[PDB]
Amino acid sequence: MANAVIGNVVTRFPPEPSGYLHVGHAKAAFLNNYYAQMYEGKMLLRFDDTNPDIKYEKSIIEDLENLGLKYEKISYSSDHFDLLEKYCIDMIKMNKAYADDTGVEDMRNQRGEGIESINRNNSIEKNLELFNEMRKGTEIGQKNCIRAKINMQSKNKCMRDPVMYRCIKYKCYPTYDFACPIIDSIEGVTHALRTNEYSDRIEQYNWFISTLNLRKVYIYEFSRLAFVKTVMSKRKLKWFVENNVVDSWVDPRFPTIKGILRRGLTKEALFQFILEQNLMQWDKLWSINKQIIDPIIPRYAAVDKNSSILLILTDLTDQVIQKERDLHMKNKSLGTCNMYYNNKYLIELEDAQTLLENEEITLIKLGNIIIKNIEKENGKIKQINALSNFHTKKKIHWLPYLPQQLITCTLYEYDHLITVDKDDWTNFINFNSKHETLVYAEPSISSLKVSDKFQFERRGYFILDKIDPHHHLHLIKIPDG
Numbered sequence: 001m002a003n004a005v006i007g008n009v010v011t012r013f014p015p016e017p018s019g020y021l022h023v024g025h026a027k028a029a030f031l032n033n034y035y036a037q038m039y040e041g042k043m044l045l046r047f048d049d050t051n052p053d054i055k056y057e058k059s060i061i062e063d064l065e066n067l068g069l070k071y072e073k074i075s076y077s078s079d080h081f082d083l084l085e086k087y088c089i090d091m092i093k094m095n096k097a098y099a100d101d102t103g104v105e106d107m108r109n110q111r112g113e114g115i116e117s118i119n120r121n122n123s124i125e126k127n128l129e130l131f132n133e134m135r136k137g138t139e140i141g142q143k144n145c146i147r148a149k150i151n152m153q154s155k156n157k158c159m160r161d162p163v164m165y166r167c168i169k170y171k172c173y174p175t176y177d178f179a180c181p182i183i184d185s186i187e188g189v190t191h192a193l194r195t196n197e198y199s200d201r202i203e204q205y206n207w208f209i210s211t212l213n214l215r216k217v218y219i220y221e222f223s224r225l226a227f228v229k230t231v232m233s234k235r236k237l238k239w240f241v242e243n244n245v246v247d248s249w250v251d252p253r254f255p256t257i258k259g260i261l262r263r264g265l266t267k268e269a270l271f272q273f274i275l276e277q278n279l280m281q282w283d284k285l286w287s288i289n290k291q292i293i294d295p296i297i298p299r300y301a302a303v304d305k306n307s308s309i310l311l312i313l314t315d316l317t318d319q320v321i322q323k324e325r326d327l328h329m330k331n332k333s334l335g336t337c338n339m340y341y342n343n344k345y346l347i348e349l350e351d352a353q354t355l356l357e358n359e360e361i362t363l364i365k366l367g368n369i370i371i372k373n374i375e376k377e378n379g380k381i382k383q384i385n386a387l388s389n390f391h392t393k394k395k396i397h398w399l400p401y402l403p404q405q406l407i408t409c410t411l412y413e414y415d416h417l418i419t420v421d422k423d424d425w426t427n428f429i430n431f432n433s434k435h436e437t438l439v440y441a442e443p444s445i446s447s448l449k450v451s452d453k454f455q456f457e458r459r460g461y462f463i464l465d466k467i468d469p470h471h472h473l474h475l476i477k478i479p480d481g
Ligand SMILES: Nc1ncnc2c1ncn2[C@@H]1O[C@H](COP(=O)(O)OP(=O)(O)O)[C@@H](O)[C@H]1O
Pocket: 014, 015, 016, 023, 024, 025, 027, 028, 048, 193, 194, 195, 223, 224, 225, 226
């Protein structure tokens, strides 16, 4: 941040309302916030509608609210079109801008080979009256674009007469390249943050600023954020949606901020992952998210609904005993859930198959028990009979066989959308990347409210997405890196 001064820093986040925000957007928005906060500065939110819906502006304001960012003001590039017009005319009168009717292909490698276009020497007043043709929309006007008069022979291709105004309320619109430095300057930005993929652009940016004798804006570049096995092109994502491969932009497989928060990511983890680091691997982002959520979420129990095996404590009765226990043992201010138990339990079959005819084991948060026999009807295991011994390296989780109180849950597990890491690209999709499994979970889990994060013991981490009628829960699995 060159020549930054505490209390005199202004940054801005300038997304286009042409789609929903994704993770890379989140890096930009966050870094703008981080540099503004570092100097006790101000951060503007600019909707960049230079070359133009409102559903997107709404979605943006909600995603920013969700990331916890707050802005001093909201502006639209549109709001300065009249002024940009004025500046355009000024440049025409300084012989710094001219009207051009050379064709797009021709113009493209006239630029490539550095020959001055025909109109580069146009008189001032022809340039102005052509600009008027453009502002009215005449067939002349549409054949004409205004461009800056810089240097067709510069080693920097961005310095070779870039287009400033195009004919397309307004009949003519400024390009990004021209609108960005002017608007940044007059809005009071002091430090404009931009992806360093647009890096040849800087000399042009500053050119415009000095050529109009405007207050300089420093540029701070950063790397763009891209992930393996991920697509963030807006066209590829709408393709996913239109073929019902997903059925919403909020799908947990989508790198949108909405989708990624639904999937379990915490804003804290995303910000830390941005600070504490060719594509990136989701593994480290989800490992940070794990480290962050693990000590502040409760632990509940679940067993497979269908493969569950019945365990009997022969020496107890069918009187259900209740015991308050703590949700998370380590952080004892997280609260207490309730634990119900009696003589009949459900355990996993992957656990049932592991018990030998006289082992001692431990039902977590309850106590040790003594396995007595393994009744196996047909080939499978039908039932297990054990002994209370409440007063071992086989500690298993369990549910009390109380079906009118156990909560039924669908576990959604997701895989990457595409198969390669980065025209016949749809052959690299994973369509069967949404896995459902049904479980019973602990009665006390009815406490949870939608959006809550928790852990299923010896299963993994989950977020409660929706609650169906009849208290049926939908649980999205949070990857754990
Ligand atoms: N993948 C990305 N990673 C980081 N920052 C990005 C990424 N994509 C866009 N940005 C930044 O997001 C801001 C708004 O982007 P937007 O105008 O929507 O541009 P784009 O057309 O590149 O999506 C810009 O500052 C842009 O440089």
